[PDB]
Paper text:
The AAV vectors are composed of non-enveloped T = 1 icosahedral capsids, consisting of 60 viral proteins (VP), and package single-stranded DNA transgene cassettes. The presence of pre-existing neutralizing antibodies in large portions of the human population poses a significant challenge for AAV-mediated gene therapy, primarily targeting the capsid leading to vector inactivation and loss of treatment efficacy. This study structurally characterizes the interactions of 21 human-derived neutralizing antibodies from three patients treated with the AAV9 vector, Zolgensma®, utilizing high-resolution cryo-electron microscopy. The antibodies bound to the 2-fold depression or the 3-fold protrusions do not conform to the icosahedral symmetry of the capsid, thus requiring localized reconstructions. These complex structures provide unprecedented details of the mAbs binding interfaces, with many antibodies inducing structural perturbations of the capsid upon binding.
The two 5-fold Fabs differ in their binding behavior. Furthermore, the VL chains of both Fabs interact with the AAV9 capsid in approximately the same region. The 5-fold binding Fabs in this study bind offset from the symmetry axis. For the 5-fold binding Fabs, the contacted aa are more spread out and are located in VR-I, -II, -VII, the HI-loop, and VR-IX. The adjacent VR-II-loops not bound by the Fab adopt the canonical loop conformation of the AAV9 capsid in absence of the Fab.
Numbering used by the authors:
A (entry chain l): 23 to 129
B (entry chain D), E (entry chain C): 219 to 434, 478 to 580, 594 to 736
C (entry chain H): 20 to 144
D (entry chain G): 430 to 480
F (entry chain B): 219 to 416
Write the structure that this text describes.
């Protein structure tokens, strides 16, 4: 199981860093992709295969991957932009993995 | 011959005869089912036109292809020592291939438990392209090569190719190959396969360093790479990797010149500085796939060739400085070195012209290199309905295959004649005690090559 | 000395399955079969069937052919019966005994029995 | 086909490239971060032939 | 040939012909999967012993290996009687080894069950080192012999080997062999494997006890041994078990002298004393591994040589006493006695020089002793994921493979020529009743050997 | 030859030629696995004195043996009736033994139901002591004969033998015969076995 910190503090008009620390068998081999989860609704694909993003995703997201860690940069945090954000990677033969998940705090 | 009868015999050997060598390494392969038996277009969507260089249009296929194209498949780190210390030059003669003990497993599901059962009567297609009609993807030093350590089962890489594009769209001059459309041999669980190939006549490799320098006929071509320092403090405090890059535009897409025409990686006495893209790079064992630190990768310094070749970080000369020089009557130069981990050959593309075809990454050039080998499973459809439905069958049994693969390559050598009174520079191990023998498995069992190994040791006159 | 040990008791409500364990201590444990005799109150002994230790394959009884399942393990040296569908009817003290041949090919009898086991089955919590 | 694109789009090269010379804006931030060259970013891959 | 047709037949016999014998033996065998298909590295630390004496380094490999090195495998306690009583000595000539009826079972593990089913197509690799390239483990008198009693079914031992070490760390000279780099044969369920051997000419083993003592030239060399008494009140009440023992020392690590050059056990008539490290002490059947007490171990004695070789608890003489003595000219001695449970051969190490190479524990020392036979299961890879990953496959199907094994050796004999008038000592069973037959299975079903058997019974004039 | 093609044919017949007769018989036999593949010592001591004359000592090997030693394995009650009425004397001359169509099974039990399944490759050992080196137990009129009625699938008896003893304890002049010690042909589902004797 990957590890990412539980909370991210924020203020309107900041960017928040969100980080996921993998291993040589997890993030080392394959990319991470970051999901938004807004409890009650379907998880949403924010960042996949590192920097590239899905057509709908706002410009304000940038993910970045280090050798063993994944970092998520959210430009322009907003009140409505808060949601529990998850790490996900492909480890093993092909099973998907998920970091514990982290709930942003917009204030 | 039968299910019960073994179709071949494991051969791994090194036989040393006179001026020639023989290397056969048999390894174990595993082939999954790619794309659920569908040729599929791929295309690079990425941004809204921000990144233009990264555009590609091509097809993905079911066929997996055997890529043995890297040296360390064929030579054992002992032999590579044996081979490099004693022999000025070498080159392959005869290729041979035997693919046997094909087993088609039939992974299934049994009410919550996966089941890898036998399917005897399923078949395995295979064929060689001896006419080079297909794209040739062994040319870019791709991954999926046979495991360096004999005892590690590997997995066959997927095959796919690219064609002409304006942006992500295709163009009327494009070509869609279908690999089914070749005559192919269907190997069922008992049969085996083989073919033989004669390497076209190539110039010997040069494993040696000039005992003499050309200043003491003008040094070879140069195209300058920006100079990077392995100490981070010395480097400029800005992100210049893309900007620094030495590029060549083809069709309005700037591609980074890599690895670049053969030149010395650094000047004598300046080991740390290295060309940005001139040198080839390898990973260490289990090195991360993005943005890893310097000591996580191996950076091969070309220095051996410096005498004859212009340095890769310095301008050529004066007239104003000369940044890039081509060919002048009376130039001589040395090739780019080859590595235990570095490729063997490349396919000389089909052109009205070429110059000194020897491929840039090192190794040997050929017009008709050793053929490709494509192996896919044969689709087995799940029970189709009773009432005939013209749509094609989209539901197949899951299978995969496993077996052996063997390759026998006859190498030729060019013996050492030297009169040099003082003793050479030999490769050698270090004696100083350590926790792991180099090129040997650790406690976990992972097999790791600690250092790349270049082939220039001996010395010949200039 | 040759000994056979059932585990402690459980209390499981109808529809629950309960496995039982029998530890064979003090003998080869693969050369002798193990029979499971059951006694429900006011009923005679009843034979749930035997397992062949080394074999792993069991021979069940006519009445219990459906519900009873038998599994074993040489490493922990114990054998298991699993009664998948408990009922009020299936309330009994379970025994594991071994065939013992008394050093003769000709004779067969259950010489060693375990101390005991009792299953209290009733829906009432 | 076309010269720079002969590669197989589905697989990484074992060769690398230098992706980052910096961590991020500031003083004394220089660093060397090597990355694998593969289907996503193809213009940094090692090529055997030039026009 | 095929699945249903048996490959080779059970041969177990002794054929007594003139001056020469033939003992064939067969056994059944199962081969697990060792080290999860991984060459691994092992030190004292991975084992956990922190001493310098017990420090070691080396690898431990999947491959299994057969060991018939022990007498009790080929000879049945009948013969080893008929073999010793009637003969003045022997030696081997030709050993023939076969291996047939391979079967491969693939264990499947469910939530609570694991069902065994045949994987017909699966294979088994086997080869023999006939050039003596690998390290040779058969000379350490390891466990894992073919069992003595044919109906037993024996598990094949793993193959691992020690290399040079400093502490737990290697040195650059410490080398690592990868067995897969040796050519081997691959056997599906129908194939068999057989070869033959020729024992290089060695001295006959001497089976006899000199009737006439040397002093009725000079006795042979001597290296003293601390005398330990099976009457435990007589022994000094101190912890002299380790400190007392004589120990030949190498590279700064003291190794116990086991057993040491052949010497008599004790002075004639005192049977309760024995060399502390001098004589082999076989474990009785049913004996545990550790800290056992006296009666659970049989103890050999060398009494038959008390004529020539000096007592191992005595000094060789005086000049002041002499505790150790090397070879003088004109010495005579006799080697240690081979036992029914003891080894047969060992390999004379490869050196520039040695003296009287015949090993200490008994048997026939050889510079080309019978090759080892290594075996493993060619791993079937479990289903790969549909998209390539450069890694080696870490998930396999759990298997083991079983079959038969049979070995035929030809022993040569030397007849008894003596004109002695009165009768000999002969080895025999003791008629007197007992709850069990010696050398035979008890009620429980476990085969036990009550006593060792020496080979020295008949007498020769000195 | 192979797995799918039979290894023999079914002959039960009797053919009366002049002064001699040929009586052939063919039955089915199931051989279980006795004594978990373990030779073991047998003796009855049920009392420290045990029984005076009923005490015995010996072993009980896993091998099974074939008893055809009875007349009604070779004769159909008619052929017997034909034999006794018309003849003064008779005697055997030659015996031919053919053993074919081996079929091996594997008893695996999963989830409470045990299911038999062909194990193709597993083998069956057989031999004929032609030097009469083993104890001869066919002479004691034991049960386990081939069945009198061809349609009866029968089960194969176990071979064990006795030796010298005093009380229930053996004496050195006893001997323990391993049957594994003889050479014996191995058979898979395709092989047969045959031999003749005068």
């Amino acid at each position: 199981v990957l590890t990412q910190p539980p909370s991210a503090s924020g203020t309107p008009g900041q960017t928040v860093t969100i980080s996921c620390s993998g291993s040589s068998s997890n993030v080392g081999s394959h990319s991470v992709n970051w999901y938004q989860h807004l409890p009650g609704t379907a998880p949403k694909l924010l960042i996949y295969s590192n920097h590239r993003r899905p057509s709908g995703v706002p410009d304000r997201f940038s993910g970045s991957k280090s050798d063993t860690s994944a970092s998520l940069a959210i430009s322009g945090i907003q009140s409505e932009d808060e949601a529990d954000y998850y790490c996900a990677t492909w480890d093993g033969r092909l099973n998907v993995l998920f970091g514990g998940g982290t709930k942003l705090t917009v204030l | 011959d039968g299910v019960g009868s073994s179709s071949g015999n494991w051969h791994c050997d090194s036989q040393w005869l006179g001026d020639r060598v023989i290397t056969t390494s048999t390894r174990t392969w595993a082939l999954p089912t790619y794309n659920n038996h569908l040729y599929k277009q791929i295309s690079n969507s990425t941004s809204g036109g921000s990144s233009n260089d990264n555009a590609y249009f091509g097809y993905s296929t079911p066929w997996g292809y055997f890529d043995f194209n890297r040296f360390h498949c064929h030579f054992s780190p002992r032999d590579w020592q044996r081979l490099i210390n004693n022999n000025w030059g070498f080159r392959p003669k005869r290729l041979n291939f035997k693919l046997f003990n094909i087993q088609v497993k039939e992974v299934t599901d049994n009410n919550g438990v996966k089941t890898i059962a036998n399917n005897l009567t399923s078949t395995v297609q295979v064929f060689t392209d001896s006419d080079y009609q297909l794209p040739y993807v062994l040319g870019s030093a791709h991954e999926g090569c046979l495991p360096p350590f004999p005892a590690d089962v590997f997995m066959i890489p997927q095959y796919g190719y690219l064609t002409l594009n304006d942006g992500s769209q295709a163009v009327g001059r494009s070509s869609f190959y279908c690999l089914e459309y070749f005559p192919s041999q269907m190997l069922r669980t008992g049969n085996n396969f083989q073919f033989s190939y004669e390497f076209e006549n190539v110039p010997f490799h040069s494993s040696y360093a000039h005992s003499q320098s050309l200043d003491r006929y003008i040094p070879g071509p140069s195209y300058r790479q920006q100079r990077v320092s392995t100490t981070v403090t010395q480097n400029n405090n800005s992100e210049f990797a893309w900007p620094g890059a030495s590029s060549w535009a083809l069709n309005g897409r700037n591609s980074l010149m890599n690895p670049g025409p053969a030149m010395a990686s650094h000047k004598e006495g300046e080991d740390r500085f290295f060309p940005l893209s001139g040198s080839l790079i390898f990973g260490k064992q289990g090195t991360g796939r993005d943005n890893v630190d310097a000591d996580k990768v191996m950076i091969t310094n070309e220095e051996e060739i410096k005498t004859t070749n212009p340095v890769a970080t310095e301008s050529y000369g004066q007239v104003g400085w000369v940044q890039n020089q081509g060919i002048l009557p009376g130039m001589v130069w040395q090739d780019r070195d080859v590595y235990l981990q570095g490729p063997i050959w490349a396919k000389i593309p089909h052109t009205d012209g070429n110059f000194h075809p020897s491929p840039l990454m090192g190794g040997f050039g050929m017009k008709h290199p050793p053929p490709q080998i494509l192996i896919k499973n044969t689709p087995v459809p799940a029970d189709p309905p009773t009432a005939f439905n013209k749509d094609k069958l989209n539901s197949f049994i899951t299978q995969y295959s496993t077996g052996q693969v063997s390759v026998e390559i006859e190498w030729e050598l060019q013996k050492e004649n030297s009169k040099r009174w003082n003793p050479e520079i030999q490769y050698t191990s270090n004696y100083y005690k350590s926790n792991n023998v180099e090129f040997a498995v650790n406690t976990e069992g992972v097999y790791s090559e600690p250092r790349p190994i270049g082939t220039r040791y001996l010395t010949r006159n200039l | 000395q040759v000994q056979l040990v059932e585990s402690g008791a459980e209390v499981k409500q109808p529809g629950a399955s309960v496995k039982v364990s029998c530890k064979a201590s003090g003998y080869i444990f693969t050369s002798h079969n193990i029979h499971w005799v059951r006694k429900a109150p006011g009923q005679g002994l009843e034979w749930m069937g035997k397992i062949n230790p080394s074999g792993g394959d069991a021979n069940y009884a006519q009445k219990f052919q459906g519900r009873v399942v038998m599994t074993r393990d040489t490493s922990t040296n114990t054998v298991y019966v699993q009664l998948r569908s408990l009922r009020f009817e299936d309330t009994a003290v379970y025994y594991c005994a071994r065939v013992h041949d008394f050093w003769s090919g000709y004779h067969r009898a259950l010489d060693i029995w375990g101390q005991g086991t009792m299953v209290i089955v009733s829906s009432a919590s | 086909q076309s010269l720079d694109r002969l590669m197989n789009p589905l697989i990484d090269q074992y060769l690398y490239y230098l992706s980052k010379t910096i961590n991020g804006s500031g003083q004394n931030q220089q660093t060397l971060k090597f990355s694998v060259a593969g289907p996503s970013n193809m213009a940094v891959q090692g090529r055997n032939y030039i026009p």
